[PDB]
Design a protein around this ligand. Structure first.
Ligand code: ADP
Ligand code: ADP
Ligand code: MG
Ligand code: MG
Lengths: 371, 61, 223, 33
């Protein structure tokens, strides 16, 4: 009797305490990694830890092993903005049958404070950590017949600073394409096809295909490479492939000058019966074969020419290929380079620095060989 | 449906569990949003009528 | 119970120490990794292109040591330094817009060790090899462009008897293709350098020309 | 009554030791070998 009365009151007190306490429990919801990684970084002084081993055995004979430490089964005490917090990771008698036949795991966070503004920060910090850890890669798609499949591993993103055009030429195109993605309601509400056209034209090796490769990586979009010289490509093969393209992707066309006919290209570019959120880019090494009426608004919303290297491009490219050099060396170079050549494309500037890689001052004394 | 309504109706809750959405679309694009639901245990909510005892409990099955 | 593999008890190992310093366990795990890895010995896996696809070719060969191929002094170390510089510097290329690829050309009399050395170099760097002879009958211009576009990571591409080169005009996009994978190292072997075009061996296509001659006085003492 | 009183003091001492005691546990992560 006495024991029963005491026990009932105690339980009620705990419930009242629970109201002025705080509990969080995630169970194998792929939150464990994010939460646990933050815990070890935050504590810096921990005793009971468990070992998880990474066996990244790439198929080359290469074995990569790294150790990721997380707290072990039990409880820990940490110091935070609020009062001391009791963190516990505990095992149970129940079992998981999904993945690996392992014990069900529950992680409990209990705090003294009564404000819940704290955990919102904690969860977000873990998201920051997980996305900082991982690095984004541009996923490339290749048309295998009538469908798209991933091609090799996700390539590393070429930064946008590598393709060096005139000042204000890259920023004006960035403003137009960022406006298109962030305004999906302005189109559908007004019945306009949610599509945007872009054209870059100029001599070969100017950076038409170079810039478009790096732009999608910055915007976290994929690319659909398409050369207009394929043998197994026909008219009906291309209309389908452009309709089942992944979302957040850019369509690229190479050397449009060889157009496939011109009259049949109208419904292909601007088709009313087509998907939404489609961005098209056009590159032609010879503008002297396209009709001027092909590049009007509706099909191309911004006309821009990509020419040879200017002084702004040479000063910056010289600092990329030869960093840590004096600014005057990136003025004597650009001065005498333009004085010995009337027109020079970046593809020739990118190849000239391959003869003196990491060897400054050699480029200024050997400009005459470019004749 | 029930859990979403519980969090929306209370707006002021203590014991909560975290469910993470990992909508990793095949483009390198990772989309993460957090859906909050009550944690393991019991809760009390206020409605037009008197206080209601809500309990969510786990089992050995 | 585990239901994944074999129906066995789930196993946990606990290490408990009295001391308050955690420097101890850091050593324990590291020693254990060393023991298991010393026992096993790495093998170079060879791959051969069967038409438009790749298939394993025989068993993993035993790694021929790099000291077995005995060339002049400083010739093996200069090639190791050049290829180790390429693998250990992936950021220097992409940041400057250069395709992350490296070209190599070996020329000399027949039977000097051009193809022998490449077999041992991949084993030293713990890389695989993709065997490809330039004498196949079912090989065309487009067939070679596809095979060269999906290279395994940490691998070296081998070419046999490039002097007998399939057309030459279709070889341009094959050697230096803008639409190709990253971390790709290509090797070229020709028993007669007097048949290649001088413009074919520039940087971008060939980043190192090297001659393999007869035995010197240093090679006889070592052999 | 008697059993409850004895257990509380003993258990707490172990928790104090946990801070002064290091623990490492791997579970079938292919580190066993
Ligand atoms: N404006 C530029 N800035 C930096 N590099 C460039 C530029 N234009 C071209 N390149 C280099 O030239 C190479 C190929 O250019 P490419 O895209 O084929 O020219 P286009 O597509 O205009 O014919 C790439 O390796 C790229 O790094
Ligand atoms: N420099 C060398 N050192 C040791 N052995 C060599 C060397 N060069 C060739 N050999 C031997 O010659 C044989 C075949 O050589 P091979 O690779 O066909 O020459 P290449 O490829 O230059 O025509 C092998 O059995 C190899 O052991
Ligand atoms: Mg082009
Ligand atoms: Mg040979």
């Amino acid at each position: 009797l006495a024991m029963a009365r005491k026990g009932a009151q105690l339980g009620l007190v705990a419930f009242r305490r629970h109201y002025m306490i705080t509990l969080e429990v995630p169970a194998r919801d792929r939150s464990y990694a994010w939460l646990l990684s933050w815990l070890t970084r935050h504590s810096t002084r921990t005793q009971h830890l468990s070992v998880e081993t990474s066996y990244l055995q790439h198929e080359s004979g290469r074995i990569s092993t790294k150790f990721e430490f997380i707290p072990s089964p039990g409880n820990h005490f940490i110091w935070y903005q609020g009062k001391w917090i009791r963190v516990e990771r505990n095992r149970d008698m129940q079992m998981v049958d999904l993945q690996t036949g392992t014990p069900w795991e529950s992680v409990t966070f209990t705090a003294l404070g009564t404000d819940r503004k704290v955990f919102f920060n904690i969860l977000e910090e873990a998201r920051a950590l997980a996305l900082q850890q991982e690095e984004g890669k541009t996923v490339m798609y290749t048309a295998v017949g009538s469908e798209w499949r991933t091609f090799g591993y996700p390539r590393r993103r070429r930064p946008l600073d590598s393709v060096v055009l005139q000042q204000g030429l890259a920023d004006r195109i960035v403003k137009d394409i960022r406006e298109f993605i962030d305004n999906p309601k302005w189109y559908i509400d007004r019945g306009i096809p949610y599509r945007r056209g872009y054209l870059l034209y100029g001599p070969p090796g100017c950076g038409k295909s170079s810039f478009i490769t790096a732009l999608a990586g910055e915007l976290e979009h994929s690319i659909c490479l398409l050369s207009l010289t394929d043998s197994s490509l026909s008219d009906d093969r291309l209309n389908h492939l452009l309709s089942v393209a992944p979302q957040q992707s850019l369509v690229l066309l190479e050397d449009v000058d060889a157009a496939l006919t011109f009259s049949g290209l109208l419904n292909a570019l601007d088709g009313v019966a087509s998907t939404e959120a489609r961005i098209v880019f056009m590159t032609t090494n010879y503008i002297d074969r396209l009709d001027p009426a092909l590049i009007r608004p509706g099909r191309v919303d911004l006309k821009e020419y990509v020419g040879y290297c200017s002084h702004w491009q040479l000063t910056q490219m010289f600092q990329r290929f030869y960093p840590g050099q004096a600014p005057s060396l990136a003025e004597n170079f650009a001065e005498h380079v333009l004085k010995a050549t009337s027109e020079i494309s970046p593809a020739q500037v990118q190849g000239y620095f391959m003869l003196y890689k990491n060897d400054p001052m050699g480029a200024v004394h050997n400009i005459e060989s470019l004749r």
